Design a protein around this motif. Structure first.
Motif, PDB file in Angstrom:
ATOM      1  N   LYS F  45       0.817  -1.209   0.000  1.00 48.60           N
ATOM      2  CA  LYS F  45       0.000   0.000   0.000  1.00 48.60           C
ATOM      3  C   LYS F  45       0.852   1.261   0.000  1.00 48.60           C
ATOM      4  CE  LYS F  45      -1.931  -1.285   3.694  1.00 48.60           C
ATOM      5  NZ  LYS F  45      -2.720  -1.175   4.949  1.00 48.60           N
ATOM      6  N   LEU F  46       2.074   1.191   0.530  1.00 45.56           N
ATOM      7  CA  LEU F  46       2.976   2.335   0.482  1.00 45.56           C
ATOM      8  C   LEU F  46       3.453   2.593  -0.939  1.00 45.56           C
ATOM      9  CD1 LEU F  46       4.998   4.436   1.792  1.00 45.56           C
ATOM     10  CD2 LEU F  46       6.557   2.494   2.041  1.00 45.56           C
ATOM     11  N   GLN F  72       2.944  11.785   7.006  1.00 39.65           N
ATOM     12  CA  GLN F  72       2.044  11.290   8.044  1.00 39.65           C
ATOM     13  C   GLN F  72       0.605  11.717   7.779  1.00 39.65           C
ATOM     14  OE1 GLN F  72       3.393  12.310  11.962  1.00 39.65           O
ATOM     15  NE2 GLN F  72       1.830  11.087  13.012  1.00 39.65           N
ATOM     16  N   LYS F  73       0.401  12.999   7.467  1.00 41.22           N
ATOM     17  CA  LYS F  73      -0.960  13.475   7.257  1.00 41.22           C
ATOM     18  C   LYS F  73      -1.523  12.995   5.924  1.00 41.22           C
ATOM     19  CE  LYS F  73      -0.252  18.167   5.511  1.00 41.22           C
ATOM     20  NZ  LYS F  73       0.798  17.911   4.490  1.00 41.22           N
ATOM     21  N   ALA F  74      -0.670  12.745   4.926  1.00 39.27           N
ATOM     22  CA  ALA F  74      -1.135  12.102   3.702  1.00 39.27           C
ATOM     23  C   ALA F  74      -1.586  10.673   3.969  1.00 39.27           C
ATOM     24  CB  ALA F  74      -0.029  12.120   2.647  1.00 39.27           C
ATOM     25  N   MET F  75      -0.820   9.939   4.780  1.00 31.99           N
ATOM     26  CA  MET F  75      -1.192   8.573   5.118  1.00 31.99           C
ATOM     27  C   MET F  75      -2.531   8.558   5.842  1.00 31.99           C
ATOM     28  SD  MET F  75       0.984   6.865   3.611  1.00 31.99           S
ATOM     29  CE  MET F  75       1.424   8.327   2.667  1.00 31.99           C
ATOM     30  N   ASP F  76      -2.714   9.488   6.785  1.00 30.13           N
ATOM     31  CA  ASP F  76      -3.976   9.574   7.511  1.00 30.13           C
ATOM     32  C   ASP F  76      -5.119  10.042   6.613  1.00 30.13           C
ATOM     33  OD1 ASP F  76      -5.794   9.451   9.550  1.00 30.13           O
ATOM     34  OD2 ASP F  76      -4.924  11.070  10.746  1.00 30.13           O
ATOM     35  N   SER F  77      -4.841  10.924   5.650  1.00 28.35           N
ATOM     36  CA  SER F  77      -5.901  11.431   4.782  1.00 28.35           C
ATOM     37  C   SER F  77      -6.389  10.360   3.817  1.00 28.35           C
ATOM     38  CB  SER F  77      -5.415  12.666   4.022  1.00 28.35           C
ATOM     39  OG  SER F  77      -4.460  12.325   3.034  1.00 28.35           O
ATOM     40  N   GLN F  78      -5.479   9.537   3.290  1.00 27.90           N
ATOM     41  CA  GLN F  78      -5.922   8.410   2.478  1.00 27.90           C
ATOM     42  C   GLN F  78      -6.467   7.258   3.314  1.00 27.90           C
ATOM     43  OE1 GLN F  78      -2.415   9.657   0.741  1.00 27.90           O
ATOM     44  NE2 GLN F  78      -4.102  11.084   0.344  1.00 27.90           N
ATOM     45  N   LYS F  79      -6.134   7.200   4.608  1.00 26.06           N
ATOM     46  CA  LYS F  79      -6.554   6.116   5.508  1.00 26.06           C
ATOM     47  C   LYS F  79      -6.189   4.735   4.966  1.00 26.06           C
ATOM     48  CE  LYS F  79     -10.537   7.545   4.955  1.00 26.06           C
ATOM     49  NZ  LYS F  79      -9.924   8.657   4.198  1.00 26.06           N
ATOM     50  N   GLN F  80      -5.118   4.653   4.175  1.00 22.53           N
ATOM     51  CA  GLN F  80      -4.573   3.344   3.844  1.00 22.53           C
ATOM     52  C   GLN F  80      -3.863   2.720   5.035  1.00 22.53           C
ATOM     53  OE1 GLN F  80      -2.307   3.103   0.253  1.00 22.53           O
ATOM     54  NE2 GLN F  80      -3.901   4.026  -1.031  1.00 22.53           N
ATOM     55  N   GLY F  83      -3.236   4.765  12.619  1.00 15.38           N
ATOM     56  CA  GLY F  83      -2.308   5.596  13.357  1.00 15.38           C
ATOM     57  C   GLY F  83      -0.973   4.947  13.682  1.00 15.38           C
ATOM     58  N   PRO F  84      -0.996   3.847  14.443  1.00 14.46           N
ATOM     59  CA  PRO F  84       0.258   3.127  14.718  1.00 14.46           C
ATOM     60  C   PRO F  84       0.958   2.623  13.466  1.00 14.46           C
ATOM     61  CG  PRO F  84      -1.681   1.886  15.449  1.00 14.46           C
ATOM     62  CD  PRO F  84      -2.118   3.292  15.215  1.00 14.46           C
ATOM     63  N   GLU F  85       0.210   2.295  12.410  1.00 16.66           N
ATOM     64  CA  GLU F  85       0.844   1.900  11.157  1.00 16.66           C
ATOM     65  C   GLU F  85       1.635   3.055  10.553  1.00 16.66           C
ATOM     66  OE1 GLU F  85      -1.894   0.139   8.441  1.00 16.66           O
ATOM     67  OE2 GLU F  85      -2.160  -1.688   9.628  1.00 16.66           O
ATOM     68  N   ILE F  86       1.079   4.269  10.600  1.00 14.08           N
ATOM     69  CA  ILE F  86       1.812   5.439  10.122  1.00 14.08           C
ATOM     70  C   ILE F  86       3.015   5.715  11.014  1.00 14.08           C
ATOM     71  CG2 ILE F  86       1.590   7.814   9.341  1.00 14.08           C
ATOM     72  CD1 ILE F  86      -1.444   7.415   9.328  1.00 14.08           C
ATOM     73  N   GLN F  87       2.876   5.480  12.323  1.00 11.03           N
ATOM     74  CA  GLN F  87       4.020   5.642  13.220  1.00 11.03           C
ATOM     75  C   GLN F  87       5.141   4.671  12.867  1.00 11.03           C
ATOM     76  OE1 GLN F  87       1.695   8.236  13.864  1.00 11.03           O
ATOM     77  NE2 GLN F  87       3.630   8.459  14.981  1.00 11.03           N
ATOM     78  N   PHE F  88       4.793   3.421  12.560  1.00 13.07           N
ATOM     79  CA  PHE F  88       5.806   2.441  12.176  1.00 13.07           C
ATOM     80  C   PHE F  88       6.413   2.777  10.816  1.00 13.07           C
ATOM     81  CE2 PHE F  88       6.852  -1.531   9.951  1.00 13.07           C
ATOM     82  CZ  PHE F  88       7.794  -2.069  10.804  1.00 13.07           C
ATOM     83  N   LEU F  89       5.607   3.328   9.902  1.00 10.33           N
ATOM     84  CA  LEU F  89       6.140   3.806   8.629  1.00 10.33           C
ATOM     85  C   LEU F  89       7.137   4.938   8.840  1.00 10.33           C
ATOM     86  CD1 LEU F  89       2.979   3.819   6.304  1.00 10.33           C
ATOM     87  CD2 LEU F  89       4.930   2.254   6.218  1.00 10.33           C
ATOM     88  N   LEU F  90       6.838   5.851   9.767  1.00  3.03           N
ATOM     89  CA  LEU F  90       7.788   6.906  10.115  1.00  3.03           C
ATOM     90  C   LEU F  90       9.044   6.336  10.760  1.00  3.03           C
ATOM     91  CD1 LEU F  90       5.479   8.871   9.392  1.00  3.03           C
ATOM     92  CD2 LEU F  90       5.939  10.068  11.539  1.00  3.03           C
TER      93      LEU F  90
END
Lengths: 48, 134, 48, 48, 49, 145
Positions: F45-46, F72-80, F83-90
Motif C-alpha cells: 500500500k505504500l 504522516q498526514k497524507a497517510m492519515d488522509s488516504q486512511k490506507q 495511526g500506529p501503522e503510520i508511526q511504524f512507517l515513520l
C-alpha cells in the motif's frame, strides 16, 4: 529455533544490533537454511 | 499427552514416606490471614474430607525465562520444562511467591513460600524443571 | 577452593560470568561447605 | 483440577445453591447463631 | 578459604549501584549463607600472641 | 520455511489431515501471521500511495521527496494506514534535514527483497484455502493477505 528465539529475545531491548550480533545471526540462519533445505529434500517427493 | 497449558487450575502435590505410608499430600494456603503456604494432607479422604477450596492455583501466565527478564524490565500456551509461570490462588486471588521472610529454623537458607498480594518482581514467578532424566 | 579463587578473581576484578556459575554450583550442593554451613547440624562459623 | 470439565453444567469444586422445588425455597443450614447449634438442615425461603 | 571464595565471588560495586537483579540475588545468597555476627565474632575471637 | 510447508502440503487431498494441522499451526500463530501479512500489506500500500497523485499534491519540494509531517498526514488522509501503522512507517522512513523522506527509496527498499517470500506466502495461502474450502479460520488470513 529455541536458540535463535533466545538470541532475539536478548537483542529485543537493544533496537540497534551490533555487528557481532549481525554476523552471529547470519551464520545461525545459514545453518537454519541448510536444515530447512534438508527437510524439503526429505519431503520434496510425495513420500507419504 | 495432556500437556498442561495456560489458564488451568492446578493443585501441587508431593509424597512423604513417614511411618511407611504414602501421604500424596498437596499444598494449600488461606490467603486472607496466614499468607504462607502450608502442606495439607490428601490421603484418607474417606476418613476425613480434605479442604480443596484453598488448593487451587491457576496458571495465569506462562512465559520463557528470557521473556521473563524482558517482561520484568517492561491463550493456553503449553508449559515447557524450564519456562516461567505465574501461579495464583483461587479464593485469595493473590499470586504464589517466595516470601523473603525466613521463618524456617531447620534449614537456615529456606525462605518460606507464601502468597504475595500483587505479582511484582521475580518473587512471584516460578520456573519448572524436569525431574525425570527421560 | 584455592583453584576456585584463582578461577574467579583476576586482575583486581571478580568475573561475574564465572562467579555466578561458581556460586550456583556451590549452592546446588550444600555438601561443599562441610559440617559447618550444613542444612541441619551445621552450627555456624563461630561454633566451627 | 480442570480435567474434562464442562462449562455451563455443574462441576466438582463449585459452590452453588440447591433450590428445593421452587426457586423461592432453598436448602440451607439454619439462621445465624441458632439454637440447633447450626447442625440441622432446612429449605428456607425469601432473603436466604 | 571458603569465606575468601564467597567474598571473592561477591558481585561488583558498580553492578550493585546499577541494581542488577542477579548481583543483588548473589549478595542475598551470600548474606543468607554467612551472617555478619559470625564474621565479627571470629574477627574478635582471641588470637594467641 | 514456506517452501518446506508447501512440500508438506504436496499431494494433499481436500480436507487432508496435514492441511488441517497446517491450519492449526496458522491459527496457533494467528497473531504472528497477521503481523507478517500486515508487514507485506503496508509496504504494498505504500508503493500504491507513492504512485497515487494526491500524495503528489502532498510532496512539496522539487527534491522529489516528502516531509515527515506531510507523509504522516497524507497517510492519515488516504486512511490506507491506521495511526500506529503510520508511526511504524515513520520509524522505517529515512528522515532528512527538512524531514524530506525519500518516498521512492522507502517504497522500493522492501519491494525487491520481499517479492519471493510474498509470492511463496501467497502460494501457500492459495493452496491451503483451495484444499480446505470450509475454513472460516483461514477466511480471516485470506482477507488480511
Amino acid at each position: 529455533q529455541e536458540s535463535i528465539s533466545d538470541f532475539y529475545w536478548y537483542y529485543s531491548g537493544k533496537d540497534v544490533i551490533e555487528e557481532q550480533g549481525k554476523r552471529n545471526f547470519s551464520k545461525a540462519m545459514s545453518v537454519a537454511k541448510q536444515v530447512f533445505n534438508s527437510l524439503t529434500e526429505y519431503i520434496q517427493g510425495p513420500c507419504t | 499427552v495432556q500437556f498442561l497449558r495456560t489458564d488451568d487450575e492446578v493443585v501441587l502435590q508431593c509424597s512423604a514416606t513417614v511411618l511407611k505410608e504414602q501421604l500424596k499430600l498437596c499444598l494449600a494456603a488461606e490467603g486472607f490471614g496466614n499468607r504462607l503456604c502450608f502442606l495439607e494432607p490428601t490421603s484418607n479422604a474417606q476418613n476425613v474430607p480434605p479442604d480443596l477450596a484453598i488448593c487451587c492455583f491457576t496458571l495465569e501466565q506462562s512465559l520463557s525465562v528470557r521473556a521473563l527478564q524482558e517482561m520484568l524490565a517492561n491463550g493456553h500456551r503449553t508449559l515447557l520444562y524450564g519456562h516461567a509461570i505465574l501461579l495464583r490462588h483461587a479464593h485469595s486471588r493473590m499470586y504464589l511467591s517466595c516470601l523473603t521472610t525466613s521463618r524456617s529454623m531447620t534449614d537456615k537458607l529456606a525462605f518460606d513460600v507464601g502468597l504475595q498480594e500483587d505479582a511484582t518482581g521475580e518473587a512471584c514467578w516460578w520456573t519448572m524443571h524436569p525431574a525425570s532424566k527421560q | 577452593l584455592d583453584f576456585l579463587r584463582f578461577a574467579v578473581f583476576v586482575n583486581g576484578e571478580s568475573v561475574e560470568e564465572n562467579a555466578n556459575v561458581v556460586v550456583r554450583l556451590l549452592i546446588r550442593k550444600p555438601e561443599c561447605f562441610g559440617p559447618a554451613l550444613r542444612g541441619e547440624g551445621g552450627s555456624g562459623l563461630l561454633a566451627a | 483440577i480442570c480435567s474434562c470439565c464442562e462449562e455451563g453444567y455443574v462441576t466438582g469444586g463449585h459452590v452453588l445453591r440447591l433450590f428445593h422445588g421452587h426457586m423461592d425455597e432453598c436448602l440451607t443450614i439454619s439462621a445465624a447463631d441458632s439454637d440447633d447449634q447450626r447442625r440441622l438442615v432446612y429449605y428456607e425461603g425469601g432473603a436466604v | 578459604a571458603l569465606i575468601d571464595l564467597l567474598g571473592r565471588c561477591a558481585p561488583e560495586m558498580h553492578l550493585i549501584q546499577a541494581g542488577k537483579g542477579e548481583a543483588l540475588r548473589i549478595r542475598a545468597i551470600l548474606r543468607s549463607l554467612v551472617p555478619l555476627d559470625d564474621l565479627v565474632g571470629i574477627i574478635s575471637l582471641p588470637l594467641q600472641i | 520455511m514456506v517452501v518446506m510447508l508447501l512440500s508438506l502440503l504436496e499431494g494433499n487431498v481436500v480436507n487432508g489431515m496435514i492441511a488441517r494441522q497446517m491450519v492449526d499451526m496458522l491459527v496457533e500463530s494467528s497473531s504472528n501471521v497477521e503481523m507478517i501479512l500486515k508487514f507485506f500489506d503496508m509496504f504494498l500500500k505504500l508503493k500504491d500511495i507513492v504512485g497515487s497523485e494526491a500524495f503528489q499534491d502532498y510532496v512539496t519540494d522539487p527534491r522529489g521527496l516528502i516531509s515527515k509531517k506531510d507523509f504522516q498526514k497524507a497517510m492519515d488522509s488516504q486512511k490506507q494506514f491506521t495511526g500506529p501503522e503510520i508511526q511504524f512507517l515513520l520509524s522505517c522512513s529515512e528522515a532528512d534535514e527538512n524531514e524530506m523522506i525519500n518516498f521512492e527509496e522507502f517504497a522500493n527498499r522492501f519491494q525487491e527483497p520481499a517479492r519471493d517470500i510474498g509470492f511463496n506466502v501467497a502460494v501457500l495461502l492459495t493452496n491451503l484455502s483451495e484444499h480446505v474450502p470450509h475454513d472460516p479460520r483461514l477466511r480471516n488470513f485470506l482477507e488480511l493477505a
